[PDB]
Amino acid sequence: TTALVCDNGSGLVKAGFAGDDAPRAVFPSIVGRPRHGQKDSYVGDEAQSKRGILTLKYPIEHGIITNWDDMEKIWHHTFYNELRVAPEEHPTLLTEAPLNPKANREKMTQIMFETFNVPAMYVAIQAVLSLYASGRTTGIVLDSGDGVTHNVPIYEGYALPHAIMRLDLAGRDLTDYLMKILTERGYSFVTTAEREIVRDIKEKLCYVALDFENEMATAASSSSLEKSYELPDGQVITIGNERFRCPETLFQPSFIGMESAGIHETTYNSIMKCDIDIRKDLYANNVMSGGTTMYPGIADRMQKEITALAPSTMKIKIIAPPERKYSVWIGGSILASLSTFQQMWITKQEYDEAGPSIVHRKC
Ligand SMILES: CO[C@H]1CC2=CC(=O)O[C@H](C2)[C@H](C)[C@@H](OC)C[C@H](OC)/C=C/[C@H](C)[C@@H](OC)C[C@@H](OC)/C=C/[C@H](C)[C@@H]([C@@H](C)[C@@H](OC)[C@@H](C)CCC(=O)[C@H](C)[C@@H](C/C=C/N(C)C=O)OC)OC(=O)/C=C/C=C(\C)C1
Ligand SMILES: Nc1ncnc2c1ncn2[C@@H]1O[C@H](COP(=O)(O)OP(=O)(O)OP(=O)(O)O)[C@@H](O)[C@H]1O
Numbered sequence: 001t002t003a004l005v006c007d008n009g010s011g012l013v014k015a016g017f018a019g020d021d022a023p024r025a026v027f028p029s030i031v032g033r034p035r036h037g038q039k040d041s042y043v044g045d046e047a048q049s050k051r052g053i054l055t056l057k058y059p060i061e062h063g064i065i066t067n068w069d070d071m072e073k074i075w076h077h078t079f080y081n082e083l084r085v086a087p088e089e090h091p092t093l094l095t096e097a098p099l100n101p102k103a104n105r106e107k108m109t110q111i112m113f114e115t116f117n118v119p120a121m122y123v124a125i126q127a128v129l130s131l132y133a134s135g136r137t138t139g140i141v142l143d144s145g146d147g148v149t150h151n152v153p154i155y156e157g158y159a160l161p162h163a164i165m166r167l168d169l170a171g172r173d174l175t176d177y178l179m180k181i182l183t184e185r186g187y188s189f190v191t192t193a194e195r196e197i198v199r200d201i202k203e204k205l206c207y208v209a210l211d212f213e214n215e216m217a218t219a220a221s222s223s224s225l226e227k228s229y230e231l232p233d234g235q236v237i238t239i240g241n242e243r244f245r246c247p248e249t250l251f252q253p254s255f256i257g258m259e260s261a262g263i264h265e266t267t268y269n270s271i272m273k274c275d276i277d278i279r280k281d282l283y284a285n286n287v288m289s290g291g292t293t294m295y296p297g298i299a300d301r302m303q304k305e306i307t308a309l310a311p312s313t314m315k316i317k318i319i320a321p322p323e324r325k326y327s328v329w330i331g332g333s334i335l336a337s338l339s340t341f342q343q344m345w346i347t348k349q350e351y352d353e354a355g356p357s358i359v360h361r362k363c
């Protein structure tokens with residue numbers, strides 16, 4: 001009876017056992033079916049590698065599960081293939097997006113008990129789990145993944161739904177933009193294989209400039225910011241100002257034609273929707289989570305930008321844990337293992353005697 005933790009993301013599923021330091025399984029949130037072994041369906045890395053003979057579907061869009069048949073296949077693959085577990089033997093903690101609809105969390109609960117016959121289950125908000133992994137119960141999380149970005153203020157352990165901000169700009173948009181600007185440089189990154197290559201470039205060589213203009217001027221007048229990158233076939237290319245122009249989009253979404261406030265502004269706006277009494281607690285506990293917060297320099301830039309927006313007397317701290325690609329998962333692991341959490345699981349009996357809407361009371 002070890003609990004399972006499944007963190008379901010737009011781009012990647014992170015899954016494993018409560019008490020482990022990291023998820024054992026990290027794989028793409030993709031289900032593929034034949035166009036014309038062969039097997040009836042494929043999930044994860046195998047679906048991506050065999051994509052030329054498959055139609056791919058992405059059942060989590062901007063953090064929200066939108067296809068239940070495909071999501072069932074993802075969970076089945078997680079349990080049976082990746083973790084090699086019988087879900088009927090393990091309490092299972094799932095994660096969900098901030099502002100996940102009531103009907104959605106009901107269907108998650110239904111499927112876990114009825115399809116997978118789990119003995120117990122819980123559904124927790126991703127950003128809240130990341131805050132827990134940072135060792136606190138009060139703060140404001142910026143969670144940015146492959147498909148969605150949220151600001152989530154949290155007080156005494158619970159998210160404050162009225163102040164949550166959602167922005168449909170995240171890692172996939174940054175990858176697409178890097179493809180575009182490397183192509184404008186004189187290269188050609190346009191195909192699906194080239195998307196995977198550019199994602200690798202983004203993850204290895206991009207960074208957030210402390211000051212965009214200073215960095216552009218450095219790049220214009222020297223080769224000091226230029227890095228080499230070797231493609232799979234051996235050709236070597238040069239990346240220059242694209243390294244920081246790509247993640248700059250988070251702070252200035254207009255670079256890709258979005259009129260949204262940038263991540264510093266949405267952080268400020270979210271704090272200002274909260275009760276005035278807790279705002280200082282939020283400013284002093286800005287926690288970054290998700291893969292799209294991984295850029296070197298992001299914390300210092302956030303500190304600078306929030307300082308410029310906040311009152312002059314305000315103490316501001318940005319916490320950017322090294323583990324933040326997996327901090328939602330870690331939060332789930334430590335929560336599921338915690339003595340005081342054990343009474344909070346929805347049990348199989350509780351489900352049988354209430355149905356899926358028990359999720360609103362217990363979660
Ligand atoms: C080495 O592993 C760590 C890696 C890590 C990941 C990360 O993302 O962040 C870093 C660490 C982090 C920045 C860190 O870095 C070095 C610094 C952090 O600074 C304070 C230090 C953390 C220590 C690791 C931790 O030592 C155990 C310090 C400790 O200090 C006293 C903190 C303890 C917190 C009390 C504890 C809480 C938050 C955690 O408890 C396990 C929560 C799960 C409690 C949740 C809770 O009380 C809610 C409100 C209640 C009800 C549920 C409400 N829900 C679900 C609402 O939505 O749950 C029952 O928090 C912890 O015990 C946190 C433990 C974290 C780990 C074991 C992860
Ligand atoms: N070192 C890195 N630098 C920049 N981006 C990174 C880095 N590592 C991972 N990423 C990006 O992070 C994203 C994946 O992060 P994450 O697992 O948090 O998202 P997700 O949970 O799948 O999606 P979402 O939370 O949006 O639903 C991808 O876009 C990936 O390219």
Ligand SMILES: [Ca+2]
Nearest residue numbers: 009010126145
């Ligand atoms: Ca996520």
Ligand SMILES: [Ca+2]
Nearest residue numbers: 252253254259
């Ligand atoms: Ca703008």
